Amino acid sequence: MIINHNLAAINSHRVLKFQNEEVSKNMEKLSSGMRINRAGDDASGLAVSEKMRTQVN
Amino acid sequence: VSQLIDEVDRIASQAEFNKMNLLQGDFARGSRATSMWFHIGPNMHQRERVFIATMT
Question: From the candidates B14, B16, B17, B18, which should be mutated to test the interface with A, based on the most A CB atoms within 10 A?
């Protein structure tokens, strides 16, 4: 078999890295207690939330 | 009566939502200005209409 490149290892590492990104996003979501932490999660939702926060204050 | 009819008009012209005035009648039955819809489904024209009459 080909030993110069472990092709299964590369794919598993790719999947693991994206899983780690997802779990980090979920961990930050848990820690903040807020669904929309950064921009891009829901732009319209974030804008509406900011407007309603101003209205509430 | 005048003093507490004035604030009735105040609620009518100021009852608001996310940059939408509600009780002015913009979402009435015969209103032409705009129409209010709720997309309550996951595909195509799965919408619904909600009517709010004038309250001035």
Answer: B18
How was this structure determined? It was done by cryo-EM
The residue type found at B56 is T
What secondary structure, in 3-state letters, does chain B show?
CCHHHHHHHHHHHHCEECCEECCCCCCCCCCCCCCCEEECCCCCCCEEECCCCCCC
A47 touches chain B (CB under 8 A): no
CA distance B48 to B44: 12
The reply to whether A52 touches chain B by the CB within 8 Å rule is: yes
